[PDB]
Design a protein around this nucleic acid. Structure first.
Ligand SMILES: [Mg+2]
Ligand SMILES: [Mg+2]
Ligand SMILES: [Mg+2]
Ligand SMILES: [Mg+2]
Ligand SMILES: [Mg+2]
Ligand SMILES: [Mg+2]
Ligand SMILES: [Mg+2]
Lengths: 106, 172, 190, 197, 136
RNA sequence: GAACUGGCGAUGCGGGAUGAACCGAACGUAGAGUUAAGGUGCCGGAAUACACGCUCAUCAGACACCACAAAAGGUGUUAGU
RNA sequence: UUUGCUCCACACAAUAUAGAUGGAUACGAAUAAGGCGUCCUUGUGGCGUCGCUGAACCAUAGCAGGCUAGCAACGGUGCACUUGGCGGAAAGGCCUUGGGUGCUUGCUGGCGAAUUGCAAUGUCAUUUUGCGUGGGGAUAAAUCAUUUGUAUACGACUUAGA
C-alpha cells in the first residue's frame, strides 16, 4: 500500500538539562500521539533510530543510523528520556526520529 | 491542610496526690492530622487554662465523622482572626454538606478576602442553621429559593490538542 | 456578590414591534424605526407575551447588574422614541447682542448657523444630525426646538448647540450668554 | 501532524499565541500565521497604545538607526512578541525563526489552504466576558501602520471568492450525504455499523 | 407586527437534571442533580449506574438535555425509583451523543482483522456510493 | 565601635537573572536512582495542573537578604462590626 | 572569447539536506450564540437536527506491491493530448469539456515469492552542480584609457567620442 511505516514518529527536543547545564548523554523525545506518562510507559525500552544522510558512501550506503532506546518517561506530557550508543549531535533538536515496535510485549 | 478532619481531643492535668482524677477538658479541633490536632488542643488549653503540654496529658483523640455527609446544610461560623493591625470577630455562612468541608471553605475564604493565614484564625463555633429565615447572609439566602435553576453561559471546553480545526463554540 | 439572576421588564405598547437578534435591537413604531447595538453588555433577552420583554443577567456582579438596568433604560428610550418621540426646547440668553440663529445648507447638509454671539465676527456652525428636525418656534421669543425619534441624537445635537456658544476669557457668572436647553419632553405628550 | 500548519490569527491573544508558536517552531513544526491584523491583546486600546508609545520612546541616544526598531505592522508586532520568546541570537533559534511566516490578511497560496486555531490562545475561551481587549490592526494603524485599508479591501474580495467556493462545496456535500443516505439499510452498511462505521 | 426575540436556550442547573460525569472514579456515567449547593457545586446521585451520592464541582460534569421530575434533596432510593419511572437510560441511549460515545468505544475495541474487514467493507460501499453519485 | 554564633577570607557546586558573605549543599574519577533550595506559558528541564476567592490600574502586580515608600484620603470593589 | 550562451528531454557523475516516510482536508461571522437540512408569505421567519472535540474525514489489501483468466457495472483513479473559464496580495494555482491510453481490491479464480539464513534505515526522497547525448532559440555590453564640469580630497558622480 501507499503506507509502509512500522515505527512511531518522534521528535528530538533537547538534551536532559537544568536551566544552564545540559547532559548530552540523555535525550528528550516527544513521541507523536503520546500525551501522558501512562501512555509513554508502553514505549519504554523501545528501540529508536535517528536516520540521516551523508554525501560519502561508507558500507554500500549514503544512509547512516544512530541507535538508542527509550529508558523512562519524562515530565507529565508524554515526553520520554532516551539514550543512544553515541549521543545525538544536538543539531537534531527538532529533527525526526523513529521509535520501532520492538522489543514488543504485545 | 484543606483536607480537614474534625477530632475530639480530651485531655487533663497530670494527676497528683492532692487532686487525683482531674476534670477531663475536651475540644473539637479541625486539623489535617492527629499530630496537628493534638498541637492545636494544647495551644488552646495553654491559652484558656493554666496548663501546658509538659504538665498535662492527652487521654483521647477520636475522629468525628459527619452524621449525614450527603445532606446539604447551611452552617453559621463564628471566627476570631488577626488582621495586620488588630483582632476581629466575624460571622459567616457556608452552604455545604459537611462541617470539615465548610471549614475548608471558610479558611479559603478568609485567606482570599482578608489575607488571613491559618496561623491567624480561631474557629469559635461551627453550627448548622436549623431552618431558613434564620439565614442572615444574602449570598446564602439566594440559593434557598423555590425551584431554583440557573444556566451556565459561556461554557469553555478544554482541548487535548494544540490545534483545532473547528472554531469552538460556547453553547451550553 | 455574583447574584444568581437579575432581571428587568420592558413594556412594549400595542403599535410597536421589537425584533432582537443576538444583541442587535430593532424597534419599529408609528413614528419610525430605531436600531441599537448592545454587544458590549452580555445580557439575555426573552419575549414573554408580545407585550413584555425580559432582560436578564446570570451570575453577574455589581457593575454587570448596573449595566443590565442601563440596557433596560436604553430599550425603553428607543420605544418611547418610536411611540411619542423626543423634543428638546432651547432658549437664547443674551445681554446686549441679539444671537442670530438660522438653518443653512453648505452642500446638501443642514447646519445651524449662529451669528453675533457676544458681538463676535466668527460664524459658528453645528451640523444637523440625521433624524433631527429643527424648527424656530414662533409665539415665544428666542426658542429653538429639536425633535426626533432618538433621544441620543436629539440631546447630543442640542448639547453641541449649547457648547458651541461657550464664553471664553470672561466671568461666565456675569456673561451668562448662550443657548441653553430649557425643556426636555416628548413630541406627542398627553 | 501536517508538514505546514496555517493558523488564523483572528480572535487569538498575542502572547499566548506567540508562546504556542514559539514552542512549535523550536520543536520543528513549520508555521504560517495569517490575519495578524485581527489578533487581540487583553486590556483596553488606550492602555495598549500607551504601552506601544513607551516602547517607541526607547532608542539609542547617539544614533537612532542602531537602536531598538519599532515595527508598526500587526504581523511584525506578533513577530516581535515571538522573538524574546525564542533564543533568536543562536543558530537553533534562527533555524526556528525561518520556520515561521506571518502575514496580514490571507495571501496566496494560503487563501486556499485549511486554517486552524489554537484554543488555548483564543480570546473567547481565555478572557473573562466583559474584559476589554484591543485589536491589533487598529493599534497598528494608530501607531503608524499604513496598509489597513488595502488589507481590508483584499480581505473583502477574498471573502467573496471564498463564499462562492463554500456554496459549491456545500451543494456537493449535500448530494454526497444524500447518496450516503441511500447506502444505509444495505448489508454492507449494516456490517459497517456493527463494526463501528 | 409580532415582536421576535431569539430564545437562546441553555441547559439549566436544576433538580432532576441529568449530568454526564467526565472525570473521577465515575468518569462517563449518568447522574441526577438532587440539590444545588452553590453556583459551582451541586449534589448528584447515580444509583442505577453506580455513581455514589456526592457533592461535586460543576466543572467535573457536563449537563445533558435530559431532565426528569425529582423533589429537591430526594434520597437515593427515591432517586432510583423516579429515574426508573422516567426511563432516563434509554432516552439517553437514543441520543446521538451517546451513540457517538458508543461508536468511539466500538472503534477503540477493534482488532487488526476487524480493521482489515472495515477497509474491505468501506471499499465495497464506496464502489456503489460513487456509482450512484455519478448516476445522480 | 563591642557581644554570641555561623560564614566569607581560604570555596568550588545547585538556586537568588546578575553578586565574596543569602538559601541548599560543601567537592577523588564515573554509572544509575532520589532529592534539597528554587521552580514547571515561552525563552528553559518540568502541569497554559486542579480548587476556592480577590483585583482592571489613561503611572496594575508579580517572592526573603534586595535593590524603598509615608502620613492622609476614595458611594472603586469585597468581606465584616 | 576557444563549437561560446540559453531552454527542453534523458543518461552519468558529484554534491548536500535545521530533517518526506498515506493526505497542509480552503466559507464568513457570533460566542448571553451558531452550523446544517427543510418549508413558507423571504424574514433579526417557522420547523427539525447537530455539537459536548480531528478518537474526524478521505485514503487505505497485491514481488516497496509481480504474471495471468474471468464475472458484474460504465463507475473510480493515473498519464499525456485536450476545449475553455477564473485567479495579481506573493497571481504561478483553481474549476472545466472530450476522446485515447494503463490500473482497478466492486466480486470470483490460477502461478510466483523461500537462503537478507532469528534484527541491523537495510537504501524506494530532493536543494544544487558539472560532464555528455539529441532537439529548439538568440547573436550584447560594462570597465580601464581619452573626454565634460551641472561633480569632486581620492574613489564616486555627470557628460562626449567609430
Ligand atoms: Mg516613519
Ligand atoms: Mg588575605
Ligand atoms: Mg534579585
Ligand atoms: Mg549564585
Ligand atoms: Mg537557615
Ligand atoms: Mg515562568
Ligand atoms: Mg518546556
Amino acid at each position: 500500500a501507499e503506507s509502509h511505516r512500522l515505527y512511531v514518529k518522534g521528535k528530538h527536543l533537547s538534551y536532559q538539562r537544568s536551566k544552564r547545564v545540559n547532559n548530552p548523554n540523555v535525550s528528550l523525545i516527544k513521541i507523536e500521539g503520546v500525551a501522558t506518562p501512562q501512555d509513554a510507559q508502553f514505549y519504554l525500552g523501545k528501540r529508536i533510530a535517528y536516520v540521516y544522510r551523508a554525501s560519502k558512501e561508507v558500507r554500500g550506503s549514503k544512509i547512516r543510523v544512530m541507535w538508542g532506546k527509550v529508558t523512562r518517561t519524562h515530565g507529565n506530557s508524554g515526553v520520554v528520556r532516551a539514550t543512544f550508543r553515541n549521543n545525538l549531535p544536538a543539531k537534531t533538536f527538532g529533527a525526526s526520529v523513529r521509535i520501532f515496535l520492538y522489543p514488543s510485549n504485545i | 491542610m484543606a483536607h480537614f478532619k474534625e477530632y475530639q481531643v480530651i485531655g487533663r492535668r497530670l494527676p497528683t496526690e492532692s487532686v487525683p482524677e482531674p476534670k477531663l477538658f475536651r475540644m473539637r479541633i479541625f486539623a489535617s492530622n492527629e499530630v496537628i490536632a493534638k498541637s492545636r488542643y494544647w495551644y488552646f488549653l495553654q491559652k484558656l487554662h493554666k496548663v501546658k503540654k509538659a504538665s498535662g496529658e492527652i487521654v483521647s483523640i477520636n475522629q468525628i465523622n459527619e452524621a449525614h455527609p450527603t445532606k446539604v446544610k447551611n452552617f453559621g461560623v463564628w471566627v476570631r482572626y488577626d488582621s495586620r493591625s488588630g483582632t476581629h470577630n466575624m460571622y459567616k455562612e457556608i452552604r455545604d454538606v459537611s462541617r470539615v468541608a465548610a471549614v475548608e471553605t471558610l479558611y479559603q475564604d478568609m485567606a482570599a478576602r482578608h489575607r488571613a493565614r491559618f496561623r491567624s484564625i480561631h474557629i469559635l463555633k461551627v453550627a448548622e442553621i436549623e431552618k431558613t429565615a434564620d439565614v442572615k447572609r444574602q449570598y446564602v439566602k439566594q440559593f434557598l429559593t423555590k425551584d431554583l435553576k440557573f444556566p451556565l453561559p459561556h461554557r469553555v471546553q478544554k482541548s487535548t490538542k494544540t490545534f483545532s480545526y473547528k472554531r469552538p463554540s460556547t453553547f451550553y | 456578590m455574583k447574584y444568581i439572576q437579575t432581571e428587568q421588564q420592558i413594556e412594549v405598547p400595542e403599535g410597536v414591534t421589537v425584533s432582537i437578534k443576538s444583541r442587535i435591537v430593532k424597534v419599529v413604531g408609528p413614528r419610525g424605526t430605531l436600531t441599537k447595538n448592545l454587544k458590549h453588555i452580555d445580557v439575555t433577552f426573552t419575549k414573554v407575551n408580545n407585550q413584555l420583554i425580559k432582560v436578564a443577567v446570570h451570575n453577574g456582579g455589581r457593575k454587570h447588574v448596573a449595566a443590565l438596568r442601563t440596557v433596560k433604560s436604553l430599550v425603553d428610550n428607543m420605544i418611547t422614541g418610536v411611540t411619542k418621540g423626543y423634543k428638546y426646547k432651547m432658549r437664547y440668553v443674551y445681554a446686549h447682542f441679539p444671537i442670530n440663529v438660522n438653518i443653512v445648507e453648505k452642500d446638501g447638509a443642514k447646519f445651524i448657523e449662529v451669528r453675533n454671539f457676544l458681538g463676535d465676527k466668527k460664524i459658528r456652525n453645528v451640523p444637523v444630525r440625521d433624524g433631527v428636525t429643527i424648527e424656530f418656534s414662533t409665539n415665544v421669543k428666542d426658542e429653538i426646538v429639536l425633535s426626533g425619534n432618538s433621544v441620543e441624537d436629539v440631546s447630543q445635537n442640542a448639547a453641541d448647540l449649547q457648547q458651541i456658544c461657550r464664553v471664553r476669557n470672561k466671568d461666565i457668572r456675569k456673561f451668562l450668554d448662550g443657548i441653553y436647553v430649557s425643556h426636555k419632553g416628548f413630541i406627542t405628550e398627553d | 501532524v501536517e508538514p505546514v500548519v496555517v493558523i488564523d490569527g483572528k480572535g487569538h491573544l498575542v502572547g499566548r499565541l506567540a508562546s504556542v508558536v514559539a514552542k512549535q517552531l523550536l520543536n520543528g513544526q513549520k508555521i504560517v500565521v495569517v490575519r495578524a491584523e485581527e489578533l487581540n491583546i487583553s486590556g483596553e486600546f488606550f492602555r495598549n497604545k500607551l504601552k506601544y508609545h513607551d516602547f517607541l520612546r526607547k532608542a539609542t541616544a547617539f544614533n537612532k538607526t542602531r537602536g531598538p526598531f519599532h515595527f508598526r505592522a500587526p504581523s511584525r508586532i506578533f513577530y516581535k512578541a515571538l522573538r524574546g520568546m525564542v533564543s533568536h541570537k543562536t543558530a537553533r533559534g534562527k533555524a526556528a525563526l525561518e520556520r515561521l511566516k506571518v502575514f496580514e490578511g490571507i495571501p496566496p497560496p494560503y487563501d486556499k489552504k485549511k486554517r486552524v486555531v489554537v484554543p488555548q490562545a483564543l480570546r473567547v475561551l481565555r478572557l473573562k466576558p466583559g474584559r476589554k481587549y484591543t485589536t491589533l490592526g487598529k493599534l497598528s494603524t494608530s501607531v503608524g501602520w499604513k496598509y489597513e485599508d488595502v488589507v481590508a479591501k483584499l480581505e473583502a474580495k477574498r471573502k467573496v471568492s471564498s463564499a462562492e467556493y463554500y456554496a459549491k462545496k456545500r451543494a456537493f456535500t449535500k448530494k454526497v450525504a444524500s447518496a450516503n443516505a441511500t447506502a444505509a439499510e444495505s448489508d454492507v452498511a449494516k456490517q459497517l455499523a456493527a463494526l463501528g462505521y | 407586527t409580532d415582536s421576535i426575540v431569539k430564545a437562546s436556550n441553555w441547559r439549566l442547573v436544576e433538580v432532576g437534571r441529568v449530568v454526564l460525569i467526565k472525570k473521577g472514579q465515575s468518569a462517563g456515567k449518568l447522574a441526577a442533580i438532587v440539590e444545588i449547593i452553590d453556583q459551582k457545586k451541586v449534589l448528584i446521585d447515580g444509583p442505577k449506574a453506580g455513581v455514589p451520592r456526592q457533592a461535586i464541582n460543576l466543572g467535573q460534569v457536563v449537563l445533558t438535555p435530559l431532565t426528569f421530575a425529582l423533589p429537591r434533596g430526594a434520597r437515593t432510593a427515591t432517586v432510583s425509583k423516579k429515574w426508573a419511572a422516567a426511563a432516563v437510560c434509554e432516552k439517553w441511549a437514543a441520543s446521538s451523543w451517546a451513540k457517538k460515545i458508543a461508536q468511539r468505544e466500538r472503534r477503540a475495541a477493534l482488532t487488526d482483522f476487524e480493521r482489515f474487514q472495515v477497509m474491505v467493507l468501506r471499499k465495497q460501499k464506496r464502489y456503489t456510493v460513487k456509482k450512484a453519485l455519478a448516476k445522480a
